[PDB]
Design a protein around this motif. Structure first.
Motif, PDB file in Angstrom:
ATOM      1  N   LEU A  33       9.057 -19.148  -7.924  1.00  0.00           N
ATOM      2  CA  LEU A  33       8.342 -19.876  -8.760  1.00  0.00           C
ATOM      3  C   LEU A  33       8.020 -19.392 -10.161  1.00  0.00           C
ATOM      4  N   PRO A  34       8.177 -20.095 -11.373  1.00  0.00           N
ATOM      5  CA  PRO A  34       7.850 -19.557 -12.483  1.00  0.00           C
ATOM      6  C   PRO A  34       6.500 -19.272 -12.632  1.00  0.00           C
ATOM      7  N   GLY A  35       6.177 -18.227 -13.223  1.00  0.00           N
ATOM      8  CA  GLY A  35       4.774 -17.476 -13.427  1.00  0.00           C
ATOM      9  C   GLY A  35       4.141 -16.998 -12.102  1.00  0.00           C
ATOM     10  N   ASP A  36       4.857 -17.069 -11.031  1.00  0.00           N
ATOM     11  CA  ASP A  36       4.546 -16.336  -9.725  1.00  0.00           C
ATOM     12  C   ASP A  36       4.928 -15.134  -9.676  1.00  0.00           C
ATOM     13  N   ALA A  37       3.522 -13.979  -9.612  1.00  0.00           N
ATOM     14  CA  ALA A  37       3.825 -12.756  -9.590  1.00  0.00           C
ATOM     15  C   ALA A  37       4.079 -12.380  -8.140  1.00  0.00           C
ATOM     16  N   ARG A  38       4.100 -12.946  -7.233  1.00  0.00           N
ATOM     17  CA  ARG A  38       4.208 -12.705  -5.799  1.00  0.00           C
ATOM     18  C   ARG A  38       5.960 -11.959  -5.562  1.00  0.00           C
ATOM     19  N   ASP A  39       5.932 -11.265  -4.667  1.00  0.00           N
ATOM     20  CA  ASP A  39       7.274 -10.464  -4.301  1.00  0.00           C
ATOM     21  C   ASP A  39       7.868 -10.239  -5.466  1.00  0.00           C
ATOM     22  N   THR A  40       7.471  -9.328  -6.338  1.00  0.00           N
ATOM     23  CA  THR A  40       8.035  -9.152  -7.718  1.00  0.00           C
ATOM     24  C   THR A  40       8.082  -7.460  -7.729  1.00  0.00           C
ATOM     25  N   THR A  41       8.995  -7.049  -8.866  1.00  0.00           N
ATOM     26  CA  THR A  41       9.093  -5.713  -9.103  1.00  0.00           C
ATOM     27  C   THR A  41       9.790  -5.639 -10.568  1.00  0.00           C
ATOM     28  N   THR A  42       9.598  -4.507 -11.077  1.00  0.00           N
ATOM     29  CA  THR A  42      10.394  -4.577 -12.428  1.00  0.00           C
ATOM     30  C   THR A  42      11.470  -3.726 -12.152  1.00  0.00           C
ATOM     31  N   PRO A  43      12.404  -3.857 -13.263  1.00  0.00           N
ATOM     32  CA  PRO A  43      13.651  -2.792 -13.160  1.00  0.00           C
ATOM     33  C   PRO A  43      13.076  -1.225 -13.145  1.00  0.00           C
ATOM     34  N   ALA A  44      12.218  -1.088 -14.091  1.00  0.00           N
ATOM     35  CA  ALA A  44      11.912   0.237 -14.161  1.00  0.00           C
ATOM     36  C   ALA A  44      11.093   0.835 -13.019  1.00  0.00           C
ATOM     37  N   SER A  45      10.387  -0.024 -12.291  1.00  0.00           N
ATOM     38  CA  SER A  45       9.439   0.498 -10.938  1.00  0.00           C
ATOM     39  C   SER A  45      10.506   0.372 -10.188  1.00  0.00           C
ATOM     40  N   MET A  46      11.561  -0.656  -9.749  1.00  0.00           N
ATOM     41  CA  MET A  46      12.414  -0.392  -8.774  1.00  0.00           C
ATOM     42  C   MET A  46      13.237   0.848  -8.819  1.00  0.00           C
ATOM     43  N   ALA A  47      14.032   1.127  -9.999  1.00  0.00           N
ATOM     44  CA  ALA A  47      14.557   2.390 -10.099  1.00  0.00           C
ATOM     45  C   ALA A  47      13.857   3.588  -9.785  1.00  0.00           C
ATOM     46  N   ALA A  48      12.529   3.514 -10.349  1.00  0.00           N
ATOM     47  CA  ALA A  48      11.859   4.923 -10.046  1.00  0.00           C
ATOM     48  C   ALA A  48      11.452   5.131  -8.773  1.00  0.00           C
ATOM     49  N   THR A  49      11.257   3.863  -7.893  1.00  0.00           N
ATOM     50  CA  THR A  49      10.883   3.964  -6.543  1.00  0.00           C
ATOM     51  C   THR A  49      12.212   4.392  -5.704  1.00  0.00           C
ATOM     52  N   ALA A  65       0.698  -1.080  -0.037  1.00  0.00           N
ATOM     53  CA  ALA A  65      -0.012  -0.120   0.035  1.00  0.00           C
ATOM     54  C   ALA A  65       0.714   1.334   0.150  1.00  0.00           C
ATOM     55  N   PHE A  66       2.052   1.332   0.833  1.00  0.00           N
ATOM     56  CA  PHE A  66       2.899   2.471   0.828  1.00  0.00           C
ATOM     57  C   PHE A  66       3.424   2.600  -0.389  1.00  0.00           C
ATOM     58  N   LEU A  67       4.036   1.363  -1.383  1.00  0.00           N
ATOM     59  CA  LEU A  67       4.536   1.485  -2.712  1.00  0.00           C
ATOM     60  C   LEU A  67       3.316   2.247  -3.653  1.00  0.00           C
ATOM     61  N   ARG A  68       2.184   1.918  -3.399  1.00  0.00           N
ATOM     62  CA  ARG A  68       1.006   2.496  -4.325  1.00  0.00           C
ATOM     63  C   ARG A  68       0.772   4.180  -3.975  1.00  0.00           C
ATOM     64  N   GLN A  69       1.012   4.338  -2.806  1.00  0.00           N
ATOM     65  CA  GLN A  69       0.883   5.882  -2.049  1.00  0.00           C
ATOM     66  C   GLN A  69       2.228   6.533  -2.878  1.00  0.00           C
ATOM     67  N   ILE A  70       3.225   5.947  -3.086  1.00  0.00           N
ATOM     68  CA  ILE A  70       4.359   6.927  -3.667  1.00  0.00           C
ATOM     69  C   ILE A  70       4.220   6.504  -5.144  1.00  0.00           C
ATOM     70  N   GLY A  71       3.299   6.128  -5.856  1.00  0.00           N
ATOM     71  CA  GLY A  71       3.271   6.014  -7.319  1.00  0.00           C
ATOM     72  C   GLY A  71       3.645   4.754  -8.128  1.00  0.00           C
ATOM     73  N   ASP A  72       4.051   3.750  -7.118  1.00  0.00           N
ATOM     74  CA  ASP A  72       4.710   2.593  -7.839  1.00  0.00           C
ATOM     75  C   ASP A  72       3.392   1.655  -7.712  1.00  0.00           C
ATOM     76  N   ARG A 122      14.702   5.977  -6.593  1.00  0.00           N
ATOM     77  CA  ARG A 122      14.726   7.600  -6.802  1.00  0.00           C
ATOM     78  C   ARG A 122      13.895   8.369  -5.944  1.00  0.00           C
ATOM     79  N   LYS A 123      12.715   7.991  -5.933  1.00  0.00           N
ATOM     80  CA  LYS A 123      11.608   8.711  -5.365  1.00  0.00           C
ATOM     81  C   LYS A 123      12.065   8.773  -3.800  1.00  0.00           C
ATOM     82  N   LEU A 124      12.493   7.610  -3.157  1.00  0.00           N
ATOM     83  CA  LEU A 124      12.624   7.725  -1.812  1.00  0.00           C
ATOM     84  C   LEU A 124      13.967   8.527  -1.446  1.00  0.00           C
TER      85      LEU A 124
END
Ligand SMILES: OC[C@H]1O[C@H](O[C@H]2[C@H](O)[C@@H](O)[C@H](OCCCCCCC3CCCCC3)O[C@@H]2CO)[C@H](O)[C@@H](O)[C@@H]1O
Ligand SMILES: *C(=O)/C=C/N[C@@H](C(=O)O)[C@](C)(Cn1ccnn1)[SH](=O)=O
Length: 265
Positions: free
Chosen positions: A148-164, A125-132, A166-168
């Protein structure tokens, strides 16, 4: 070394896995290199930096104090607690817990902190609050790197993580003191920081948080630059490779070498 993009490709070829990477100017957000930047990768231990950004946000709001001492029990400890296992008698302050989570990847410290921000759901929720709107935490410290393959849990993308990151670190969402604290925790990494400095040419700045998981998962979120300046954010994630840890480390270092030799782009 070849150009950064050519080296990234060589790494996928040699590892048989996917590499995700972003190279971004820290001050401006200018994206220099982006490869599979919008694809998902397990965050592994790199989530600990975002975690402490949420803790600092609470401190800034007056809802937390880095001085506050948390007393916990041995039953609260999970796998790999190098610092926290030493303080069953006296406890640790919230600030010490963040230092242990980031600089030593202490898992119990990370879980204690995660509870203070509302668990995996609260951090998300904090991530959503800062725009990620992409990064997501779903599990606690010692289960989130299953990859696990195909498992979206606990993931980020390089672009999202870099942006986040930078925001922090730079957007003034966190107070000046908190921005400085988060940066210093990354500068103080004991797990990979000293090792990286040992192989970096003179003059190169490094701050970082690394992570590893199953199925070859490996990653690093870092600040790097010449003239002893944190000029760029570099985020590299690897997934789905059967390679040894040594070779995954070597390939990430190889991408770093390509960046170092061809910095002015
Ligand atoms: O011409 C540039 C440089 O080329 C070499 O430096 C090598 C260095 O000897 C080697 O140890 C390192 O390996 C790379 C080590 C990278 C470690 C991790 C980097 C992280 C940082 C950010 C996130 C991704 C990876 O590459 C550089 C560049 O070829 C020379 O030794 C050095 O004198 C010279 O200034
Ligand atoms: C974060 O990415 C953690 C990865 N590996 C941890 C773990 O799963 O808790 C261990 C303990 C290795 N480690 C110690 C410090 N940093 N990583 S496990 O892979 O041995």
């Amino acid at each position: 070394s070849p150009q950064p993009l050519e080296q990234i490709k060589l790494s996928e070829s040699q590892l048989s896995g996917r590499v995700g990477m972003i190279e971004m100017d820290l001050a401006s957000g200018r994206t220099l290199t982006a490869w599979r930047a919008d694809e998902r990768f397990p965050m592994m231990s790199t989530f600990k930096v975002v975690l402490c950004g949420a803790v600092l946000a609470r401190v800034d709001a007056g809802d937390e104090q880095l001085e506050r001492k948390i007393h916990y029990r041995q039953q609260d400890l999970v796998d790999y607690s190098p610092v926290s296992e030493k303080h069953l008698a006296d406890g640790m302050t919230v600030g010490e817990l963040c230092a242990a989570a980031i600089t030593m990847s202490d898992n119990s410290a990370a879980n204690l902190l995660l509870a203070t921000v509302g668990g995996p759901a609260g951090l998300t929720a904090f991530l959503r609050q800062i725009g990620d709107n992409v990064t997501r935490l779903d599990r606690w410290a010692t289960e989130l790197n299953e990859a696990l393959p195909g498992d979206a849990r606990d993931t980020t993308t390089p672009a999202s993580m870099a942006a986040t990151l930078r925001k922090l670190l730079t957007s003034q969402r966190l107070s000046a003191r908190s921005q400085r604290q988060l940066l210093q925790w990354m500068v103080d990494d004991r797990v990979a920081g000293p090792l990286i400095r040992s192989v970096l040419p003179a003059g190169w700045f490094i701050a970082d948080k690394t992570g590893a998981g199953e199925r070859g998962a490996r990653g690093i979120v870092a600040l790097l630059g010449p003239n002893n300046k944190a000029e760029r954010i570099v985020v590299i994630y690897l997934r789905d490779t059967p390679a040894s840890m040594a070779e995954r480390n070597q390939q990430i270092a190889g991408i770093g070498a390509a960046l170092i030799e061809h910095w002015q782009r």
